[PDB]
Design a protein around this ligand. Structure first.
Ligand SMILES: [Cl-]
Ligand SMILES: [Cl-]
Ligand SMILES: [Zn+2]
Ligand SMILES: [Zn+2]
Lengths: 68, 68
């Protein structure tokens, strides 16, 4: 796992939760990590079809549209 | 912003990118943060319709299904 748990716990508290189980924080961190990886994988293929090696913000923005 | 950028950069490198612009890392961190907040907001309403104050892993798992 790359994402730290603490910041994910703050997101859920920030959205209005009174109490958050430790298992809720870990579940959302793993779901967002898996989303990040699938978006990143699609952004890499977009950059390669554009002839580039550098992943740019427009690749991320176009890749997220396949998941919406 | 709650999520740190560095770990998001590692996710994109881990998925296979050779080089990542700083703007790509920031864009994906903001998209995952916004997803985390919308999931968390829906999980809070599920827990309240179940009569609970504590957000649990099953609330997260049911809330992500509205976005798939
Ligand atoms: Cl998926
Ligand atoms: Cl949205
Ligand atoms: Zn996946
Ligand atoms: Zn939203």
């Amino acid at each position: 796992m790359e994402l730290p748990i603490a910041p994910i716990g703050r997101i859920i508290k920030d959205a209005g939760a009174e109490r958050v189980s430790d298992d809720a924080r870990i579940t959302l961190a793993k779901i967002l990590e898996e989303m990040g990886r699938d978006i990143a994988s699609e952004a890499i293929k977009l950059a390669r079809h554009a002839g580039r090696k550098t992943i740019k913000a427009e690749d991320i923005e176009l890749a997220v549209r396949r998941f919406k």
